[PDB]
Amino acid sequence: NISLKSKTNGSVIKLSDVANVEIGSQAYNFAILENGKPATAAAIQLSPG
Amino acid sequence: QDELMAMAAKNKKFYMVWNEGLPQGDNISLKIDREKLSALGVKFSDVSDI
Amino acid sequence: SISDVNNAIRENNVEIAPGRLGDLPAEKGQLITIPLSAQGQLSSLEQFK
Lengths: 49, 50, 49
Prior knowledge:
Chain A is mostly beta strands.
């Protein structure tokens, strides 16, 4: 529902018209397949000694 | 927490059981209608600042 | 004024942050992803002048 102003027609335009707003992921860099089924994982790395 | 206090009141194995904290209170919510603000041509940042 | 020169230097000497073609999220069927580079930093006296 954020509002912008279009100078071409001088009209109020909602953001949804000029973009798709979605709850997505912050970054797209990794993917995980546990046994062929996509999943998520985290790797623990031991502290020294 | 209230239910646990109710149970503890009638337990007899505890001399006294109280809750540490502040009580809930009344709060007033001001609902800035954003489209009405836009009708006046007033930036929401200005309202937030004031 | 002395602020104008600073502002002009900041505007002209600006480090661009180009992305990458076929960067996730990416459309189905693509086979090529290529880095994109662009340099907005001036490196020679004639460029600064």
